[PDB]
Write a protein that binds this ligand. Structure first.
Ligand SMILES: *[C@@H]1O[C@H](CO)[C@@H](O)[C@H](O)[C@H]1NC(C)=O
Ligand SMILES: *[C@@H]1O[C@H](CO)[C@@H](O)[C@H](O)[C@H]1NC(C)=O
Ligand SMILES: *[C@@H]1O[C@H](CO)[C@@H](O)[C@H](O)[C@H]1NC(C)=O
Ligand SMILES: *[C@@H]1O[C@H](CO)[C@@H](O)[C@H](O)[C@H]1NC(C)=O
Ligand SMILES: *[C@@H]1O[C@H](CO)[C@@H](O)[C@H](O)[C@H]1NC(C)=O
Ligand SMILES: *[C@@H]1O[C@H](CO)[C@@H](O)[C@H](O)[C@H]1NC(C)=O
Ligand SMILES: *[C@@H]1O[C@H](CO)[C@@H](O)[C@H](O)[C@H]1NC(C)=O
Lengths: 48, 312, 41, 225
């Protein structure tokens, strides 16, 4: 967290720096997107 | 002015990809043209704001006691209680108006606080000096006499004002009070500035979403097309993708240049209106309000200016 | 001694006009100033 | 006034000469045109994805079938360059035409007349303007009138004499502490208060800030004498 790393969450294959998010996903949902269809948040597979 | 944007080719057309760097360099100096054009637009926006608002050379202050012959400027004069010294009408205007792929939004040189300071200096000069501050040294003059000047400027004898000072003061106060209600009630009152913001946002959104466009390629995303294919077969597809994205950038830059010309025409009109109606009384018909022009008061607004054309 | 400095822009000198209900300032002299304006044609 | 005008022009010459970017507008126009020409010319050296930037080599070296597609890429790139150049020239020409319309307006309204539009022709009360030709442009020497030495005065909207309000026909009521004078607005030239330069408009009750003073009557001395 807080370090620019390449992240591979179940094959999402994105690059960026990871921070804790206050947003609450629905249980079935796995990753989040913004208006521009860019990955904005990801749920950690190991944890929830 | 509009949003003060800037674009990085080497990150927009491709991101982590470094092969696109070499493939783009051979394309030539299109991106130098793009950066120069966008920097020109940004400097032009800074100049637009500076020309519209920095008409005054000295920051003026209204006196601590604000009896101006019965006229009430509390709605246009700054509000010291709140943090940002914006007038109530300026606050209403600011409240009503409502991407890391190489797109960066440069901040304006003049912060909204300094634009409000310019507007307050213009207001204080207009109130305490009249038109004299715009054509030399600011000369103190009582407001009931400045407005008598403005009456003489529309072919009405100053007799009329001095016999009717209270009535004129009440009419002006009521009109100023109704300005806030008319601005607040109608959502599309600030439609011009809202349309400017919407146009900039739509341009950014279409430019960003143009990345997902295939441009007749097997894969829009760069990692898949390069890795899955061998370099010989992948180079033609990547060239097609770069051509599509470079056409997208050229279209965006040309649209921003046309929109910058439109906004520069509007900013030249705003500078002319400030000079000829805030800094003077204009004889041009319908240039500053419907009626025989008396005054005008600048008010800062998000990416624009609002004039309160007081007419007879 | 000399180095690059950053600062907040100064919009101009503060000039509180000495407004009063009966005070006026009439200039006693003038200045014929010539200004140059350049325009591409 | 003649000496001030002469000194002003003498200073204009030096201010134009010394300033690094006095003619920055015309210099920027010339630079933009030159850079557009240079980028258009240098675009011939770009491959546009072809295996050759020099075109006498791509046709001869390659077979006509592949040479056809290579020349297609080259022509597409160069015609894109031409269309971009023409579109940028059209936008720049619209900007220059706006500036030329402004220059024609300034000529008409300040060289051919005296404009009351504020700050349209120089900072100050416009007096004259003198066109001067410049490379791909025009230079206006906006001669304006700037008031210089202001002085505080006590002013009143009217004058209460003989139970009737008096207003300045043209000018301002001012006082040097003791005596009340009428003065033109843009130049301190005090004049004795008289019925000639004041017009009566009722009684003293209505006006707010009216001061009680005497108004000289020109006709009375001749009746007495
Ligand atoms: C992850 O799995 C290990 C293996 O059993 C377990 O010990 C651990 O508690 C798990 N943690 C979470 C957050 O699921
Ligand atoms: C100006 O109007 C406001 C309300 O709009 C009022 O509270 C204020 O007292 C008025 N100012 C003066 C000097 O009367
Ligand atoms: C102007 O001066 C003060 C306030 O500035 C106050 O006495 C009143 O409003 C005016 N006085 C006059 C007109 O004598
Ligand atoms: C007006 O100013 C000029 C120089 O600008 C000066 O020579 C002249 O004496 C001044 N006149 C008065 C009355 O002060
Ligand atoms: C008029 O008096 C005020 C009093 O504060 C002063 O600040 C101002 O400079 C005076 N004006 C002139 C022209 O001397
Ligand atoms: C005001 O001007 C008059 C001009 O007639 C002069 O007699 C008087 O002494 C002057 N007073 C002051 C205080 O300057
Ligand atoms: C003018 O004369 C009347 C008559 O007594 C007087 O009441 C009034 O105060 C005078 N004007 C002024 C400004 O004092």
């Amino acid at each position: 967290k807080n370090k620019c790393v390449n992240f591979n969450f179940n094959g999402l294959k994105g690059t960026g720096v990871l921070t804790e998010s206050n947003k609450k996903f629905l249980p079935f949902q796995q990753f989040g997107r913004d208006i521009a269809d860019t990955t904005d948040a990801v749920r950690d597979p190991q944890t929830l | 002015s509009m949003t003060k944007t800037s674009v990085d080719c080497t990150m927009y057309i491709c991101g982590d990809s470094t092969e696109c760097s070499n493939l783009l360099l051979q394309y030539g100096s299109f991106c130098t043209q793009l950066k120069r054009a966008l920097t020109g637009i940004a400097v032009e926006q800074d100049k637009n704001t500076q020309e519209v608002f920095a008409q005054v050379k000295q920051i003026y202050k209204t006196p601590p006691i604000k009896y101006f012959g019965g006229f009430n400027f509390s709605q246009i004069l700054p509000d010291p209680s709140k943090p940002s010294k914006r007038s109530p009408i300026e606050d209403l205007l600011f409240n009503k108006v409502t991407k890391f792929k190489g797109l960066t939004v440069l901040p304006p040189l003049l912060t909204d606080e300094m634009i409000a300071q310019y507007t307050s200096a213009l207001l204080a000069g207009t109130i305490t000096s009249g038109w004299t501050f715009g054509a030399g040294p600011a000369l103190q003059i009582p407001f009931p006499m400045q407005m008598a000047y403005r009456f003489n400027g529309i072919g009405v004898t100053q007799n009329v004002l001095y016999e009717n000072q209270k009535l004129i003061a009440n009419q002006f106060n009521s009109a100023i009070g109704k300005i806030q209600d008319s601005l607040s009630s109608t959502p599309s009152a600030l439609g011009k500035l809202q349309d400017v913001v919407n146009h900039n946002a739509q341009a950014l959104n279409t430019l960003v979403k143009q990345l997902s466009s295939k441009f007749g390629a097997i894969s829009s995303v760069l990692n898949d097309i390069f890795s899955r294919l061998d370099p010989p077969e992948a180079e033609v597809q990547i060239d097609r993708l770069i051509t599509g994205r470079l056409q997208s950038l050229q279209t965006y830059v040309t649209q921003q240049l046309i929109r910058a010309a439109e906004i520069r025409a509007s900013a030249n009109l705003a500078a002319t209106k400030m000079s000829e109606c805030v800094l003077g009384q204009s004889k041009r018909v319908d240039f500053c309000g419907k009626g025989y022009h008396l005054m005008s008061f600048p008010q800062s607004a998000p990416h624009g200016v609002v004039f309160l054309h007081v007419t007879y | 001694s000399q180095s690059i400095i950053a600062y907040t822009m100064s919009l101009g000198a503060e000039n509180s006009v000495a407004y009063s209900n009966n005070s006026i300032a009439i200039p006693t002299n003038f200045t014929i100033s010539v200004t140059t304006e350049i325009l591409p044609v | 006034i003649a000496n001030q005008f002469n000194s002003a022009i003498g200073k204009i010459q030096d201010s134009l000469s010394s300033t690094p970017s006095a003619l920055g507008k015309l210099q920027d126009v010339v630079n933009h045109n030159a850079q557009a020409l240079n980028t258009l010319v240098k675009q011939l050296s770009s491959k546009f994805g072809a295996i050759s930037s020099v075109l006498n080599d791509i046709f001869s070296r390659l077979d006509p079938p592949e040479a056809e597609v290579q020349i297609d890429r080259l022509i597409t790139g160069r015609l894109q360059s031409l269309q971009t150049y023409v579109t940028q020239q059209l936008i720049r020409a619209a900007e220059i035409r706006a500036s030329a319309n402004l220059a024609a307006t300034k000529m008409s309204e300040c060289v051919l007349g005296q404009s009351k539009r504020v700050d349209f022709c120089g900072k100050g009360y416009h007096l004259m303007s003198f066109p001067q030709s410049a490379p791909h442009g025009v230079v206006f020497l906006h001669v304006t009138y700037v008031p210089a030495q202001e002085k505080n005065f006590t002013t009143a909207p009217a004058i209460c004499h003989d139970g009737k309000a008096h207003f300045p026909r043209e000018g301002v009521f001012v006082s040097n502490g003791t005596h009340w004078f009428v003065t033109q607005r843009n130049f301190y030239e005090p004049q004795i208060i008289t019925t000639d330069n004041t017009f009566v408009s009722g009684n003293c009750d209505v006006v707010i800030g009216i001061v009680n003073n005497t108004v000289y009557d020109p006709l009375q001395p001749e009746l007495d004498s």
